[PDB]
Amino acid sequence: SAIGVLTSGGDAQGMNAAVRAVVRMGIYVGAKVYFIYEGYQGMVDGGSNIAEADWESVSSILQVGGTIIGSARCQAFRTREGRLKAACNLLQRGITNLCVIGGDGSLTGANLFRKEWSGLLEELARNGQIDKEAVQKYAYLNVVGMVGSIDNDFCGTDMTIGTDSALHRIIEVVDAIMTTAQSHQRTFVLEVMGRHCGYLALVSALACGADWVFLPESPPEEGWEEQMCVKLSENRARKKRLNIIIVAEGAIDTQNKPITSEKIKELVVTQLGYDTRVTILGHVQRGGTPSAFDRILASRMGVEAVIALLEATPDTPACVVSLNGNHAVRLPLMECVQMTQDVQKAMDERRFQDAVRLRGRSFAGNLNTYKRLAIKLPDDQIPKTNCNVAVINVGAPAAGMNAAVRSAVRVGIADGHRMLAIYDGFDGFAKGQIKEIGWTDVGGWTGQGGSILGTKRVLPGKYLEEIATQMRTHSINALLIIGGFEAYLGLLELSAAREKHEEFCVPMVMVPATVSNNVPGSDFSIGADTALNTITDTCDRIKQSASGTKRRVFIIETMGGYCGYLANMGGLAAGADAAYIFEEPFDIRDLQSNVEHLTEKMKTTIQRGLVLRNESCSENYTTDFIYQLYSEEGKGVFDCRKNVLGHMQQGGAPSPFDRNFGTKISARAMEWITAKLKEARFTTDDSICVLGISKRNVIFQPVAELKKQTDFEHRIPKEQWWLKLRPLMKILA
């Protein structure tokens, strides 16, 4: 059949990429796809608001905020008179497959429209349409929705398209403003979006280590005014030169009265006398460019949406398309709309703990983790073990390392250990560059790129005797490594050295940090998102500059070593025409065929090309080799330029996703450490682990069990979850 796609409601960054994926996948599968402009308003007006879409019509859209086809509150669609016209215009062009990208209400109205769709019986009773067309274009209206929203508002979905982007906007402002708050001191109250949902405010507060945060779901609890001011004064006594307070638009006390940012300014000015400013971030949070995450999320969903449409039968209920635990799923639409309204109900009825449950387990996670790192119980009240736990960074620098260290340390001190910081990886370890570290020592770290402790790729196998000596000297009871494949190898070497050295017979756990994302036992690694955004950032600027002539193709080398994750996913996000990687062999025939494709592409109006090459994807087919092939076989048609991105892809500042990934998983790692230490008063495979992300949830996997899942020769995992996405790039280009 035919597929109509529209964007309705508040706009979110990534709507454009969704539309693109729906048009491209629809055409690829041989459907016809129409744009419906201006949300449901276009559907009501009909005429030229419905226009068939070709391949070319959704190029240059990917990297652009908002929607190229428009959203619109449409009142007429709230009336049967309006919905009648809508059905009429859809039948007028044979569209009974509908893809609505929008928010909580947009989706609510789509659900209603499916149910009423045998309002073609009404159009029959008038001059609307022929008798048999009530049967052909039957009561079978096939509806699939995608949630576009910065709020992480909807209940079916783990993530909504636009949240990551908006969070980039929020943290861009927060990082910017920090520098003016140090100089001056100054306490800054910032007002973020979330009239009804606090997700954005919470994940912002986490990503900037904010000093306090206000959510509608979890009100402050009586006697917070004193309790907040006590914390702020403690900060000035710690010589912290600023405070950041994050406040959701719809913040509230435990009796549903608003807590406004101006009310917080007056409390701080009144009680503490500090110099204080309010910033109302506003519609910037809907602006800017889609982050890599939102582009890849939206892309995966557009594709799944179109699949869900075609697989649908008149029996299958309308669904919403979502990524839950990094897997595409269809959820019944009616039930999803219902559960979201329940959350609002719980709040209205002062059942706040309910409102938090109803938001989900991950929402409670962010919240709870935030508290642990934001508030410290006075030393008196944290009793606890006389255990020394060490934190270290191993491998190349990776954005998020500092956030992870901050989390581990604070969680460990909260758990009542003494925390030791080991400097310069195993280098420093061997040279006993070890010093105790405290709560304040890691203040300010969340948003710092690189590694403050310092990192080195050097492995510990040659320095076992020296390293063991330091563990003895410093009475190190356990170890937390934050790092890449080198860290993994470090654990295996220390595991084997246990027999020769008792000092290693302690619990050791690692959390993965590397721009490459090549650590076995985790689908993701701290810092890869930052590099994906850097690559995406870079391609955007490349398309921006030299618009006019075109007939140019850019070959761009990416990091990763043998791991193709960056090349592949950055290729998706940047809408690359090809991404060459080690994990999928290619021969000269493959290259010549892409070249011939791009040569035909240059006959269309999209006279540009973008080709990524993983840095170690082929010993013979180098970046130069491919540049030379493409240059030569393009001679009449196009030319090329090459860029080796290089070390910039480690990041300036870590992206929000890498900060919160670092923060959260490092905390989960320390919990595990303290639990292992509690069991004494002691060494097998299960006390040395990688803690990574596997599909739905985080799990501690013994290094012994990962050897068989590892390619040691190329330093990547054997099965890698993202290889199932390879068909997408070809389709979506």
Ligand X SMILES: Nc1ncnc2c1ncn2[C@@H]1O[C@H](COP(=O)(O)OP(=O)(O)OP(=O)(O)O)[C@@H](O)[C@H]1O
Where does this chain touch ligand X (CB under 6 A) — which range of 73-81, 246-254, 310-318, 633-641? 73-81
For position 109 contacting ligand X by CB under 6 A, the verdict is yes
**Contact pattern from residue 643 through residue 672 relative to a copy of itself, giving x for each residue in contact according to CB under 8 A and a dash for the rest:** xxxxxx-xxxx-------------------
Burial class (CB in 10 A: 0-12, 13-18, 19+), 547: exposed
CA angle, corner 173, sides to 172 and 175, nearest 5?
70
Which of the ranges 135-143, 182-190, 379-387, 692-700 carries the binding residues for a copy of itself, by CB under 8 A?
Answer: 182-190
From the list 59, 106, 152, 514, which residue makes contact with ligand X (rule: CB under 6 A)?
Answer: 106
Do the Cβ atoms of 12 and 94 come closer than 8 Å? no
* Positions of E strands within 9-88: 32-36, 50-52
**Site mask, ligand X, residues 33-62, x = CB under 6 A?**
-------x----------------------
Mask 690-729, x = binds ligand X (CB under 6 A)? Answer: ----------------------------------------
Helix axes 361-374, 352-359, angle to 10 degrees: 110
Closer to a copy of itself by CB, 433 or 440: give it.
433
3-state SS, residue 694: strand
Least distance to a copy of itself, CB of residue 43, Å: 16
The reply to whether 452 sits near a copy of itself by the rule CB under 8 A is yes
Residues comprising the chain, all counted: 733
Smallest Cα–Cα separation from 260: which of 214, 220, 218, 227?
214
Options 262, 342, 436, 587; binder of a copy of itself; rule CB under 8 A: 587
Rounded Cα gap, residues 92 and 89, in angstroms: 5
Candidates 71-79, 124-132, 315-323, 398-406 — which segment interacts with ligand X by CB under 6 A? Answer: 71-79
For the bound state, the minimum distance from the C-beta of residue 179 to a copy of itself, rounded and expressed in Å, comes to 3
| Contact (Cβ atoms closer than 8 angstroms) between residue 385 and residue 366 | no
Confirm or deny that 194 is annotated as ligand binding. yes
Pairing of strands 710-711, 716-717: antiparallel
- List the interface residues with ligand X, window 135-154 (CB under 6 A): 149, 151, 153
59, two tokens? 């190029």
**624 annotated among ligand-binding-site residues:** no
What is the rounded CA–CA span in Å between residue 381 and residue 372? 14
- In the set 2, 112, 278, 364, which binds ligand X (CB under 6 A)? 112
> According to the annotation, is 560 in a ligand binding site?
yes
Q: Does 399 bind a copy of itself (CB under 8 A)?
A: yes
The binder of 261, among a copy of itself, ligand X, none, by C-beta within 5 to 8 A per type, is none
What would the two tokens of residue 39 be? Answer: 């949300």
Q: Which of residues 86-125 bind a copy of itself (CB under 8 A)?
A: none
Per CB under 6 A, does 8 bind ligand X?
A: yes
Number of residues that bind ligand X (CB under 6 A): 19
Number of residues that bind a copy of itself (CB under 8 A): 94
Among a copy of itself, ligand X, none, the one that 151 touches (CB under a kind-dependent 5 to 8 A) is: ligand X
Rounded Cα distance, 393 and 487, in Å: 8
For residue 347, say whether it is annotated as part of any ligand binding site: no
Residue 149 labeled ligand binder = yes
Q: How many CB atoms lie within 10 A of CB 125?
A: 8
Contacted entry of ligand X, a copy of itself, none for residue 109, CB cut-off 5 to 8 Å set by kind: ligand X
Own/partner pairs, 628-633, CB within 8 angstroms, 24+ separation: 629/591, 629/592, 629/595, 630/553, 630/555, 630/595, 630/598, 633/592, 633/595, 633/596, 633/599
Would you say 106 or 534 has its CB closer to ligand X?
106
Q: Does 320 sit near ligand X (CB under 6 A)?
A: no
Of residues 420-439, which lie at the interface with a copy of itself (CB under 8 A)? 424
Q: Which of the listed partners (a copy of itself, ligand X, none) does 77 bind, with a CB threshold of 5 to 8 Å by partner kind?
A: ligand X
The two three-digit tokens of residue 154, written as one number:
């909807």
- Residue 474 gets which letter from DSSP? T
Among residues 32, 78, 474, 498, the one that binds ligand X under rule CB under 6 A? 78
Residue 518 annotated as part of some ligand binding site: yes
Cα–Cα distance measured from residue 424 to residue 419, given in angstroms and rounded to the nearest whole number:
16
Applying CB under 8 A, among 176, 313, 377, 679 the residue interacting with a copy of itself is: 176
Rounded to 5 degrees, what are φ and ψ at 456? Answer: -145, 145
Tell me: is residue 73 an annotated ligand-binding position.
yes
Check the annotation: does 615 bind a ligand.
yes
Q: Has 516 been labeled as part of a binding site? A: yes
Least distance from a copy of itself to the Cβ atom of residue 662, Å: 14
Secondary structure class of 534 (helix, strand, coil): helix
Q: How far is the CB of 447 from a copy of itself (least distance, A)?
A: 10
Q: In the structure encoding, which two tokens stand for residue 574, read together? A: 């940047």
Is 409 an interacting residue with respect to a copy of itself (CB under 8 A)? no
Give the footprint of ligand X on residues 152-211 (CB under 6 A).
153
Which residues have a Cβ under 8 Å from the Cβ of 132 and sit 6 or more positions away?
Answer: none
**Cβ–Cβ contacts within 10 Å for residue 711, how many?**
16
Find the shortest distance in angstroms from Cβ 278 to a copy of itself.
8
Among 103, 216, 460, 507, binds ligand X (CB under 6 A): 103
103 binds, among a copy of itself, ligand X, none (CB under 5 to 8 A by kind): ligand X
Residue from 16, 49, 108, 660 that binds ligand X (CB under 6 A)?
A: 108
Q: Which two tokens stand for residue 381?
A: 């009240």
Q: What whole-number distance in Å separates Cα of residue 174 and Cα of residue 243?
A: 11
Q: After which residues is the chain broken (C to N over 2.5 A)?
A: 681
The answer to whether residue 594 forms part of the interface with ligand X (CB under 6 A) is no
Q: Is 288 left (phi over 0), alpha (psi -120 to 50) or beta?
A: left
**Residue 265 near a copy of itself by CB under 8 A:** no
Residue 102 near which of a copy of itself, ligand X, none (CB within 5-8 Å, type-dependent)? ligand X
Using CB under 8 A as the binding rule, whether residue 448 contacts a copy of itself is answered as yes
277 binds ligand X (CB under 6 A): no
Which listed option, ligand X, a copy of itself, none, makes contact with residue 162 (CB within 5 to 8 Å by class)?
none
373 is a site residue for a copy of itself (CB under 8 A)? no
Q: State yes or no: is 686 an active-site residue.
A: no
Kind of pairing between the strands at 434-437 and 418-422? antiparallel
Please state the closest distance from residue 109 (CB atom) to ligand X, in A.
2
What angle, 0 to 180 degrees and rounded to 10, lies between the N-to-C axes of helices 163-182 and 199-207? 50
Binds a copy of itself (CB under 8 A): choice among 230, 496, 588, 723: 588
Buried b (16+ CB within 10 A) or exposed e, 676-706: bbeeeeeeeeebbbbbbbeeeeeebbbbeeb
How many C-beta atoms surround the C-beta of residue 593 within 10 A?
Answer: 12
With b for 16 or more beta-carbon neighbours within 10 A and e for fewer, the 608-623 pattern comes to bbbbbbbbbbbeebeb
- Residue closer to ligand X by CB (options 35, 40) is 40
Q: Is 637 exposed, middle or buried (0-12, 13-18, 19+ CB in 10 A)?
A: middle
Among 13, 187, 558, 687, binds a copy of itself (CB under 8 A): 13
Question: Using CA atoms, how far apart are residues 401 and 179, in angstroms rounded to an integer?
Answer: 21
What mask of x and - would describe binding to a copy of itself in positions 287 to 326, judged by CB under 8 A? xxx-------------------------------------
Contact pattern from residue 489 through residue 528 relative to ligand X, giving x for each residue in contact according to CB under 6 A and a dash for the rest: ----------------------------------------
Q: Which of 11, 45, 54, 151 is catalytic?
A: 151
Residues that bind ligand X (CB under 6 A): 8-10, 40, 73-74, 77-78, 102-106, 108-109, 112, 149, 151, 153
Annotated catalytic residues are 151
Specify binding-site residues for Mg(2+): 104
